[PDB]
Design a protein around this ligand. Structure first.
Ligand SMILES: *[C@@H]1O[C@H](CO)[C@@H](O[C@@H]2O[C@H](CO)[C@@H](O[C@H]3O[C@H](CO)[C@@H](O)[C@H](O)[C@@H]3O)[C@H](O)[C@H]2NC(C)=O)[C@H](O)[C@H]1NC(C)=O
Ligand SMILES: *[C@@H]1O[C@H](CO)[C@@H](O[C@@H]2O[C@H](CO)[C@@H](O)[C@H](O)[C@H]2NC(C)=O)[C@H](O)[C@H]1NC(C)=O
Ligand SMILES: *C(=O)CCCCCCCCCCCCCCC
Length: 326
């Protein structure tokens, strides 16, 4: 055998030596080297730490500025909030886990870090489809009068929750489970086990396709049809060159966020396929670890593009820093 199964735990090491145990009680030092263990948490603090002032000042820069109620900011505040739920939830759990070498809260606690990480790079996936549709409707024109605003900008934000909850809570209870992974300091969704009690088989596909492949294809459909709408379609619409100066820069940031959304998410999710297809494979702890935690950097770089490459908004932020200058 390759690893070990349990009632709640899969650990990718054979009970060959007999030093392999449960991750809910024991520090899994039997897995690898402890300096790497704390190296994960040492890399972890540098995460949580920085996801605060870059997320927090973003929620406040919008409430402070009664001038930033645009359908660009509506979707791009939704991150500042959703990430802070992770730092004050998902990251809280992982830390305690990484520093000791196991999930102490355990059966109840895994169901937090595994959940928030699934209600983070999933609620932004339902935002980054609207972020390819907000750019699509005021560039190509599918109908006549296509203005967004406020009562339209809430309809794309309140939708990201309705689609993220459709696939983040069901594993917690009812249709799947939240389970530890890799070096067993991280958690998430099952890829290894049938566990035909909670019926994973159907949930896996309903998850992967409806919430990775389909949102991507209905981003690429809205993307490929926009290089085409820049050249031959938009020279007949006859919009001005003063209007498409910042409109030619914000697009060129918004679809850089799509890139980042794959930069680490493929090394993780695409490999989550590999694991899911091999189920008894000889893939140790290191396999899922680095991609899991790199995947976890998905709370911090989002504002770092939104602040930096969206200069449109980068002025309201500097107003808090000075607070009365020339
Ligand atoms: C992999 O190897 C483990 C080695 O520890 C092994 O744990 C063994 O588990 C048995 C049964 O759970 C324990 O039996 C002891 O506990 C019962 C409680 O009622 C009592 O009869 C005695 O205290 C008895 O010793 C053993 O303590 C334990 N074996 C050793 C060598 O101490 C598991 O089989 C495996 N665990 C996994 C799947 O990670
Ligand atoms: C358990 O681990 C073994 C050992 O690596 C894996 O064996 C695979 O199948 C045969 C051995 O009979 C080899 O020719 C392959 O190269 C192995 N595959 C891989 C991943 O390289 C196997 O993955 C595991 N056993 C099963 C069938 O689940
Ligand atoms: C500039 O850098 C920010 C302003 C610096 C002073 C902030 C004062 C905060 C006081 C908060 C009390 C008002 C809250 C009630 C809102 C209705």
């Amino acid at each position: 055998m390759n690893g070990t199964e349990g009632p709640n735990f899969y650990v990718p090491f054979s009970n060959k030596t007999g030093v392999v145990r449960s991750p809910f009680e024991a520090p899994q030092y039997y897995l690898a080297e402890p300096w790497q263990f704390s190296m994960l948490a040492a890399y972890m603090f540098l995460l949580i730490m920085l996801g605060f002032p870059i997320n927090f000042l973003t929620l406040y820069v919008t409430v402070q500025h009664k001038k930033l109620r645009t359908p660009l900011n509506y979707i791009l505040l939704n991150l500042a909030v959703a990430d802070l739920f992770m730092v004050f939830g998902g990251f809280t759990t992982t830390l305690y886990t990484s520093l000791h070498g196991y999930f102490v809260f355990g059966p109840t606690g895994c169901n937090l870090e595994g959940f928030f990480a699934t209600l983070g790079g999933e609620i932004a996936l339902w935002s980054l489809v609207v972020l390819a549709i907000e750019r699509y409707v005021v560039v190509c024109k599918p109908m006549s009068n296509f203005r967004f605003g406020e009562n339209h900008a809430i309809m794309g934000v309140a939708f990201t929750w309705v689609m993220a909850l459709a696939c983040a809570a069901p594993p917690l209870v009812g249709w799947s489970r939240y389970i530890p992974e890799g070096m067993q300091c991280s958690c998430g969704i099952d890829y290894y086990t049938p566990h035909e009690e909670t019926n994973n088989e159907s949930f896996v596909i309903y998850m992967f396709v409806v919430h990775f492949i389909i949102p991507l294809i209905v981003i690429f459909f809205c993307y490929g049809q926009l290089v085409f709408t820049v050249k031959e379609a938009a020279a007949q619409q006859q919009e001005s060159a003063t209007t498409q100066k910042a409109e030619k820069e914000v697009t060129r940031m918004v679809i850089i966020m799509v890139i980042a959304f794959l930069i680490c998410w493929l090394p993780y999710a695409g490999v989550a396929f590999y694991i899911f297809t091999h189920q008894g494979s000889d893939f140790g702890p290191i396999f899922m670890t680095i991609p899991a935690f790199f995947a976890k950097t998905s709370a911090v770089y989002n504002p770092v593009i939104y602040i930096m490459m969206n200069k449109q908004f980068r002025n309201c932020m500097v107003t808090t820093l000075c607070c009365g200058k020339n």
